[PDB]
Design a binder for this molecule. Structure first.
Ligand SMILES: Nc1ncnc2c1ncn2[C@@H]1O[C@H](COP(=O)(O)OP(=O)(O)O)[C@@H](O)[C@H]1O
Ligand SMILES: [Mg+2]
Lengths: 524, 97, 97, 175
């Protein structure tokens, strides 16, 4: 509707102040000595976090123009999280330094559009430098170091995460859940498993807990529910003939099939248990082909060329044994050729390279892990529910950081990598003087993440930086030990991906933000 | 255990449903349809109605026949096989050669 | 292989449905309708009702007839062709010339 | 459109293409992603839904005689036709895949004539003097190849004459 308009410096000043509030709140959570921020909720108990992206989300300002500034800087923090899930606090700091210096350049009377180009060109040069500095992260100790550093230098976290990635594998799936106890615990699952229970509580093979273990069972996959269509007896009989246990996968099994089945299992005629498919039809049908191929079985194509009676005993898949309980069904090992298993995985390559990324890849990889890899679950210990939230959150950040470090490598931490690359780019200039200043502005902003860490430690940000700049290679100051040395030796590592992403996302928003002449907002 | 039909009752068995050879080389998948062709497994004594004589069925055992599948057609399981029971009237045709 | 009808049953086939010659020159399209015209492919033994004397059907093989398409009319597929099976009573008229 | 990367990219599309998926995921001719490549296929355009009404066999069997792939365009195809189709394709009797028309009645119906004329085929006029099995293999259009994925169907090049191509374009001038 009706609009309030600000022009030039008045607009930018309001925007800057809004940005400063957002960034100041974010800065206190950066580094080994970083401090927690508490977010209030009318719903229940407040959340306390050291995670910059979460803090950024919650900040909104009373001044309409200031809010606009904060909202725009909010995105860099949020975008960084989307890319690597870590370094969000660091990204915000870069935006803080870039914007303040950029606006200062704008005040000088320089064309901001040119300043933006200088910044953008400088960013491109900085990114190339990061790749050269980046070193491979492969050993468990380095992975542990990134996990430990990500989790606010918690050694136990890095230790447990390193064990899990090695154990599950490169394409394995790792998740985190709360713990019953006060101690952190790791759970690893191998083979094919899913969150499906048994339709017949009555059929329990040996351990009680709804536990069914079948030895050298035949596995049945179907596309229909069996109510009054009990017919399929020659298939069931063929199994009775075999003298082997039967595992059943289909949309649903009614009491009619179960009633006859229960008597059959109890007196020793046949040992058979049935469980309902994965869940949603496109999803269950999609996962059925792999189950059958993995076990060497055949999926019954009700839809295509198969019928309920029609299906030989040989069609059914084979496994050494399975484990079943009310909540879950697990197969020890279906017998299928390595080539066929790998082959399902091979067709999955299109599935892996999907435009969707979020959601599709997470579920897809879980299928893939089950097909050939392993799945790990981490439980987090803590006396109270809120402590658990903080501890668990950091563990996830470390998990994301390790995933990022493995794929793109690591660079020295403490902000040393950004300051070290800045010295290299002292030779970068472009089309005109305004761009040259913009380039120069970005180089200066690079220094800030390093100094915030030192600032949060209660020490002179500028003095530590002068010695760090004075140093060579990976030399730097360790905030936690309060002394100088080789950062790599220290165990402080920054994944290359988070560092790169932070700089890129921070600068892209900052370049446009500094070029704003007029701002439009609703009246009080 | 082969069934003995009771007068005017004919026991026949149904053949394959929508056999995969219609229209040429095209395979037509079954879409929930049924077939009227079968063989006569057994012949009853004949039709009793009107007392004076019992008329023998105009059919013999082992013939290939066409019949009207309706309410008058009953289903029984013989030696774990499917058999249909209907009257002479329900059988529409005889397939020869 | 051909079809042998089961007494009193007549096997006939339909001509063309709503042929484009109605009213004269004008072509009138199909309006979702069927035709009562047909020819007799085969003749059954006759009526077996009332025991004595099985009476032969009045309709000879190869005739062109008009019939009432009622419940007593069944459809069979013979050598991949469409045929109709009904009793003598269902047929209403004979087209001779 | 918005790019995934930080770099600007250009995409060029050759020939006739539309946003249609395949109703038979099962039939994939060669590449993965549900990709179907039919070599010198016959193209069929129809005005009706296909379910229990199977009667189109002489048209479909005619295709079988040829030994060439068949592309199907219609309002919809359901599992009954697809079921017979998947098995027929699996044993190599016929290599056939079916897809749904462009989308909306005045939309898809309008775009069908051009597809047919471009490929040299005939649109089946349910509305006019045509029936489900009334139409010879002559009617079906021809193209050297077609690419089908879950989201889109593309025809490499339908074989049609320029006078017909230009003519369709010429009638488009009012449009
Ligand atoms: N003990 C330490 N000594 C020096 N630098 C550290 C130490 N721990 C962490 N850092 C650095 O400070 C950065 C910020 O830590 P973090 O809380 O994880 O912020 P992000 O949330 O990563 O901005 C790290 O990425 C790392 O480079
Ligand atoms: Mg972290």
């Amino acid at each position: 509707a009706a609009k309030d308009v600000k022009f030039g410096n008045d607009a930018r000043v309001k925007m800057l102040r809004g940005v400063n509030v957002l960034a100041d709140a974010v800065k206190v959570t950066l580094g080994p000595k970083g401090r927690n921020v508490v977010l209030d909720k009318s719903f229940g108990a407040p959340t306390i976090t050291k995670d910059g992206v979460s803090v950024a989300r919650e900040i909104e300002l009373e001044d309409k123009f200031e809010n606009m500034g904060a909202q725009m800087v909010k995105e860099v923090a949020s975008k960084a999280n989307d890319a690597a899930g870590d370094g969000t606090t660091t990204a915000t700091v870069l935006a803080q330094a870039i914007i303040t210096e950029g606006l200062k350049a704008v005040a000088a009377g320089m064309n901001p559009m040119d300043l933006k180009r200088g910044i953008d060109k400088a960013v491109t040069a900085a990114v190339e430098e990061l790749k050269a500095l980046s070193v491979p992260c492969s050993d468990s100790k380095a992975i542990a170091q990134v996990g430990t550093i990500s989790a606010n230098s918690d050694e136990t976290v890095g230790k447990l995460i390193a064990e899990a990635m090695d154990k599950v594998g490169k394409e394995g799936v790792i998740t985190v859940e709360d713990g019953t106890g006060l101690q952190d615990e790791l759970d690893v699952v191998e083979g094919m498993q899913f969150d499906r229970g048994y339709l017949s509580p009555y059929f329990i093979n040996k351990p009680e807990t709804g536990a069914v273990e079948l030895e050298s069972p035949f596995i049945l996959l179907a596309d229909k529910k069996i109510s009054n269509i009990r017919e399929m007896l020659p298939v069931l009989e063929a199994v009775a003939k075999a003298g082997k246990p039967l595992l059943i996968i289909a949309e649903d099994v009614e009491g009619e099939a179960l009633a006859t089945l229960v008597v059959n299992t109890m007196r020793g005629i046949v040992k058979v248990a049935a469980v309902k498919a994965p869940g949603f039809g496109d999803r269950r049908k999609a996962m059925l082909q792999d189950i059958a191929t993995l076990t060497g079985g055949t999926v019954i194509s009700e839809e295509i060329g198969m019928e309920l009676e029609k299906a030989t005993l040989e069609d059914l898949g084979q496994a050494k044994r399975v484990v079943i309980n009310k909540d879950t069904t697990t197969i020890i090992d279906g017998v299928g050729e390595e080539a066929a298993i790998q082959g399902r995985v091979a067709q999955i390559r299109q599935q892996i390279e999907e435009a969707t990324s979020d959601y599709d890849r997470e579920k897809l990889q879980e299928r893939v892990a089950k097909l050939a890899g392993g799945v790990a679950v981490i439980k987090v210990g803590a006396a109270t529910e809120v402590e658990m939230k903080e501890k668990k959150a950091r563990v996830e950040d470390a998990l994301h950081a390790t995933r990022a470090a493995v794929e793109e490598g690591v660079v020295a931490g403490g902000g040393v990598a950004l300051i070290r690359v800045a010295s290299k780019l002292a030779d970068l200039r472009g089309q005109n003087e305004d761009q040259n200043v913009g380039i120069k502005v970005a180089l200066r902003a690079m220094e800030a993440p390093l100094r915030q860490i030192v600032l949060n430690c209660g020490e002179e940000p500028s003095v530590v930086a002068n010695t760090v700049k004075g140093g060579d290679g990976n030399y730097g100051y360790n905030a936690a030990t309060e002394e100088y040395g080789n950062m790599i030796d220290m165990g402080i590592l920054d994944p290359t991906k988070v560092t790169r992403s932070a700089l890129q996302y921070a600068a892209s928003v900052a370049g446009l933000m500094i070029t704003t002449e007029c701002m439009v907002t609703d009246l009080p | 255990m082969n069934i003995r039909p009771l007068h005017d009752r004919v026991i026949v068995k149904r053949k394959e449903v929508e056999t995969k050879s219609a229209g040429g080389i095209v395979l037509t998948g079954s879409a929930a349809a049924k077939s009227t062709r079968g063989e006569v497994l057994a012949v009853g004594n004949g039709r009793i109605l009107e007392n004076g004589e019992v008329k023998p069925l105009d059919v013999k055992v082992g013939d290939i026949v066409i019949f009207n599948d309706g309410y008058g057609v009953k289903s029984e399981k013989i030696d774990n096989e499917e058999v249909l029971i209907m009257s002479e009237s329900d059988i529409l045709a005889i397939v020869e050669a």
